[PDB]
Design a binder for these strands. Sequence first.
RNA 1: UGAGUAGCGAAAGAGGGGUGAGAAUCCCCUCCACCGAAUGCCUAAGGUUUCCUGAGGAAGGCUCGUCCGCUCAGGGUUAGUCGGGACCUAAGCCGAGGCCGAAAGGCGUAGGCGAUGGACAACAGGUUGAUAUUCCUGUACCACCUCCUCACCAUUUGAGCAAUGGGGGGACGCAGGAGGAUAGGGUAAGCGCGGUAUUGGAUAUCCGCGUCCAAGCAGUUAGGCUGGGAAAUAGGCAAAUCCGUUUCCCAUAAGCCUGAGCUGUGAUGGCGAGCGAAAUAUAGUAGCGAAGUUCCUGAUUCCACACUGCCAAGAAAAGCCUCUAGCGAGGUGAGAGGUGCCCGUACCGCAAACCGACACAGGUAGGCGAGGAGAGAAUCCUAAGGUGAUCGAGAGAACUCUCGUUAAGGAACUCGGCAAAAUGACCCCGUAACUUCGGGAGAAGGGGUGCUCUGUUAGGGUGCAAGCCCGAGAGAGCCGCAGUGAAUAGGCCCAGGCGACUGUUUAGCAAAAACACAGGUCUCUGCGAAGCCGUAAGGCGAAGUAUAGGGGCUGACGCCUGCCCGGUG
Lengths: 275, 44, 24, 93
Amino acid sequence: AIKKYKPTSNGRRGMTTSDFAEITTDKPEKSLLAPLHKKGGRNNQGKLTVRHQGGGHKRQYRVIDFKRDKDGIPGRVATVEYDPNRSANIALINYADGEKRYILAPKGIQVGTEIMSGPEADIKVGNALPLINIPVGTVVHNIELKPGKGGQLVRSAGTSAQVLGKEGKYVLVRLNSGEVRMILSACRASIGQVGNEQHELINIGKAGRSRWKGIRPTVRGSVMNPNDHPHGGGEGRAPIGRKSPMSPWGKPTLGFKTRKKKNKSDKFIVRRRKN
Amino acid sequence: MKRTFQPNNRKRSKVHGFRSRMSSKNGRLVLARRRRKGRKVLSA
Amino acid sequence: IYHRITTWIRKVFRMNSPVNDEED
Amino acid sequence: MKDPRDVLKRPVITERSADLMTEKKYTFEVDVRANKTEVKDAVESIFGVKVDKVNIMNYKGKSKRVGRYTGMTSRRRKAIVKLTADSKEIEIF
RNA sequence: UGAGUAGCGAAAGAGGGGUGAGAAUCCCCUCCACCGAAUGCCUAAGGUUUCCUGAGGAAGGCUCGUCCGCUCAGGGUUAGUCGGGACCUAAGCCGAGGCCGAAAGGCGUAGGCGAUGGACAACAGGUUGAUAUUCCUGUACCACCUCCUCACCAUUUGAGCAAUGGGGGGACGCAGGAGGAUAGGGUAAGCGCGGUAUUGGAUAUCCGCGUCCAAGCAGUUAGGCUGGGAAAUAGGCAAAUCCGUUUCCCAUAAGCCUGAGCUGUGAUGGCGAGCGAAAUAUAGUAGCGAAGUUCCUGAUUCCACACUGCCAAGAAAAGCCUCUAGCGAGGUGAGAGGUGCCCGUACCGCAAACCGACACAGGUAGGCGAGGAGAGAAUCCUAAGGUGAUCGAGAGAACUCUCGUUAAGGAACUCGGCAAAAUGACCCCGUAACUUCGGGAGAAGGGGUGCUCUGUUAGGGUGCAAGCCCGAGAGAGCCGCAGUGAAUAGGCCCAGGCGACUGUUUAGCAAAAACACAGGUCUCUGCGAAGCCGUAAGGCGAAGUAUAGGGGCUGACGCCUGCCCGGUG
């Protein structure tokens, strides 16, 4: 849910926050906590490769085995916890081994529900089983690109994916925004789209909340001096007279493909740019 | 008003110390220029 | 008593606002 | 080397030190690299007196210009050994 | 030369004596003045003796000078417990082999370095011309070691030590609100003082003082454990009677861990108002020494990020608590005996001992920071503690500056109500257009607050009472021009352009109609990324994953955002 704030002040006029209803416990387990030094977007050389990063609130990583390498062992969802690191909520799950591992949380999961990581596991949400056993068209999340590497795909909240069908090599998958790839059949994946779909609807409502993110402000390019930016110079709000809108780096950004025309992944691209 | 000189011995030592120059060949060159001229007080 | 004494002088500088206006 | 006897330099003759003579303690200059543990073995050998709580102090040299030529004083390091009760002094003698 | 002209560096001094060739400026005494949420102290940074005593004084003192942070002679910082190192770790850095690079070198494991953090045992008075949670007089505490003294045990059926290993714990955000107690202030009691000649007070008079720690011991404010016992264990690289997990038993508290600060012990000790010698090298100490209670008031401190709430969910490791692996022939449990090192300790640190060429109206963490009024670290006046802030004398011109005043008028001044004036303190009455319904709104516009009595009020705080306090409401009265009388604590009503706002910007001419922001939109990016920093390796993005990131454009919100792909991409 979304709790709208009354406009007691100018920053209250638009700001909104998620219900946090999924959250159960105020604190993370100590055993899986990890440090997160903030690079600030700087290179190891010390130069800032990425613009407007850092200055945000301190964060502490929770260990999360997306790989789910263990199998045949039933688990249980004890608690759910907020994750500063990403839009997706974290749900702690207690294994029958007594092992504990934070895991990505699809919506509609209930506390105490059983979850098996094995191939023989049921389709029921929260389970993760290999693509060969997956029925066509079922929603899937946290898909790995290769086995044992972890599921880079579909980690953010509210994202989803669907299977168009499968061969022995490779299983088809609908990636978000309609793109398709022949992901390896042996590769593991987890059924059920990620929760916290309401995160997109959240409104920041003030400059101050952005500082906590912390998203540093970005100067408009025309305002910038001509030496610093291509669109700079002029006598007040200079027209984008220069041919082809441009990044401060020389490559054009509006409609210009940044793809390498030759790539190993090009064979896997059955479909591209549905818009 | 605040001025450019705000002394800190740890900073002067870590930055302008003899081993700060020993750390790199260029600093060894600085020490070499320091010694060829016969300066009584090398480094900082 | 040696009564040694030493005197030191320095040029310094500088300003240049210069506060000059016109002709334009 | 090492030997206790060479550790000492000269006694510190000051009005502040003469008052300490009634305190059953006697100041002596000591080598800069010497430790308190070494000084305790010196009095037990040279004087033969039992040793209690030894204190040691270092002093940065004062400037002592002679005409044009300034020059730092050498760094003295006196030590204060608080001798045990009932023990004859060898100082001054 | 300008010149004996500018300046003499914010902001109280006066007198008496003393020293001396020389005294406005030095010293002492008596008044007076200024700071006192400091111009007070304590300690970093940094300075590196500038501290102290005895002398000198030509130069350095915006002036003389017997005086100096000056110049000379000696003298002065004392630590197992304070800070740091014989403990740890963060950012970051170094970095065996190694990954790369014409060379030089770059990158980065293992490992190490590195506090601004975590761990850690000593507190009260005294002492010098100084340095004192270091020296001293008391009481202590931690760690380690047995020529020792007792007590308990066990000889691989093994008394115990128990890891570089596994867990536990350490271990952490912001805001707010009750509570307990205390560092501190004041009242009644108590003890030492003085009867004051300026009218009047042995009197509800006056002045001054009103106590004391770490600890070894007992319990208490109260919080936290969510429960403890038994059995079973695909796990926590091997193992585990440890943890985690599972299943039952008993759950309204037996039990588990931590507490500020209190009562007696620490103390038949010393602080203490005031007396104040011999005299010594006549400073002024030695030395003597009373009461030492009670109530009110109490935090910004502590219990403690304990509790509640919230989002932006908020370090790392060791010291510790346990577990086994593993070591074993003498060990444990308490007393005595000893050991405990290396550096920093002076002074200046709101400043004449530093940043500033100066003995410069500026700049410099943090920790203590009182009283009367007051909401208050506002403001004014005063304690504790300092400061007489180092060129002056006297005339009282213009003129310049800092201010106070102003007859009749008012913004007729001026580019412009610039500057100045006025309003402003609490309680009460009352309050419009407009609006996103929050605002606007201290709207505007008015009234009352000084003193006395009925009134140790009505009502509350604490207390057995006694008492101390917080205190309206009113009535009657008294006065003055005056009444938050001093001092500081908004001037408003409108009408339009631009910009949502807070915020940011040219330090040192321009702070804004500029920038930014949330939002809106386009485009690119499928992870070995698009974009990058780099010859590369590596790394950022990212311990991310199209509801996520990069770039362009537009700027909250409301109504909207039309047509054109010929040309240029």
